[PDB]
Amino acid sequence: DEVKYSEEVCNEQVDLYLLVDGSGSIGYPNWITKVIPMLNGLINSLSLSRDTINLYMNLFGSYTTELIRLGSGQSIDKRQALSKVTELRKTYTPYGTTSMTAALDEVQKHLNDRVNREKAIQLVILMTDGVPNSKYRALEVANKLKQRNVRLAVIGIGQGINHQFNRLIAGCRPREPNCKFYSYADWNEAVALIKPFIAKVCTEVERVANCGPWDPWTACSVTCGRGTHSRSRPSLHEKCTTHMVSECEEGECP
Ligand SMILES: *[C@@H]1O[C@@H](C)[C@@H](O)[C@@H](O[C@@H]2O[C@H](CO)[C@@H](O)[C@H](O)[C@H]2O)[C@@H]1O
Ligand SMILES: [Cl-]
Ligand SMILES: [Mn+2]
């Protein structure tokens, strides 16, 4: 048989992969005056914690650079994540080519390795001017991510933004105003864009678990008159009953 039980589903767990374009096309003035404050405002709006949002962060240029791993201090504490952005303002100048496909591939690898949290919403935030090393290769991996139920939002940054590509990889429809997946204004709009994707919403649902077949009932405790016997089974789930006791009769007692 099976067991039924109640449960609240809130979708509070989110693995958020922040992929930041650090390539030479971005432009140094833009980096300082626009990208850094974008990162600051965005990350400041994320209530990171062990049990809810966990941040991953990658910087992609000629190489991809994994800045923050899911689960670490910097993944779950907003203040620590902000320090990484500050470290970037002080010590990184954008240069080189644009490994966008490889950055997205790092997310794929998380899923493949089963490093993400299974019950966690998977959310990629791609921050780019939308001029990757290869347009087809980057669209391809993004589409692979979406077919795995990964959500993807795009934030345009840089001195020379290819909106057409950004809208395409975000999945924006033509003739449709205010795409819910792409923003290219300031941090305020990006934050609003990201909000519906990470909103905790609580519903009460019923759940079903297969408890597996019972073992045979034991022989009666007494071989005459009233007694009891029991049947057990492996716990295939936390909510599954594993033991029963019933009253049995083995005829009369002389
Ligand atoms: C199994 O075989 C039965 C035919 C009886 O001989 C049982 O013995 C009886 O057990 C009851 C209750 O357990 C006692 O009150 C009796 O004293 C005893 O004869 C036996 O278990
Ligand atoms: Cl690429
Ligand atoms: Mn570039």
In the chain, where the domains are located: 1-10+200-254, 11-199
CA–CA distances in Å: residue 193 to residues 20, 22, 155, 190:
17, 22, 9, 5
CB distance 28 to 94 below 8 Å: yes
Tell whether residue 134 is among the known ligand binding residues.
no
Residue 166's nearest CA partner among 231, 224, 100, 229 is 100
Pick one of 1.10.1740.10, 3.20.20.70, 2.20.100.10, 1.10.599.10 as the CATH number of 1-10+200-254. Answer: 2.20.100.10
User: From CA 81, how far away is CA 86, in angstroms rounded?
Assistant: 9
User: From CA 62, how far away is CA 22, in angstroms rounded?
Assistant: 9
**Residue in 220, 228, 248, 253 to alter for ligand 1 test, most ligand atoms within 8 A of Cβ:** 253
Resolution of this structure in Å: 2.2
Q: Which residue's CA lies nearest to atom 9 of ligand 1?
A: 224
User: From CA 200, how far away is CA 207, in angstroms rounded?
Assistant: 20
- Where in the chain does DSSP place strands (E)? 2-9, 14-21, 53-60, 64-68, 121-128, 151-156, 182-183, 203-210, 226-232, 243-249
Residue 105's nearest CA partner among 138, 69, 62 is 138
User: From CA 13, how far away is CA 191, in angstroms rounded?
Assistant: 18
Q: How far is the CA of 252 from the centre of ligand 1 (A)?
A: 10
1-10+200-254 and 11-199: identical CATH topology:
no
Report the nearest atom of ligand 1 relative to the CA of 254.
19
CATH T-level fold of 11-199: Rossmann fold (3.40.50)
User: From CA 127, how far away is CA 112, in angstroms rounded?
Assistant: 23
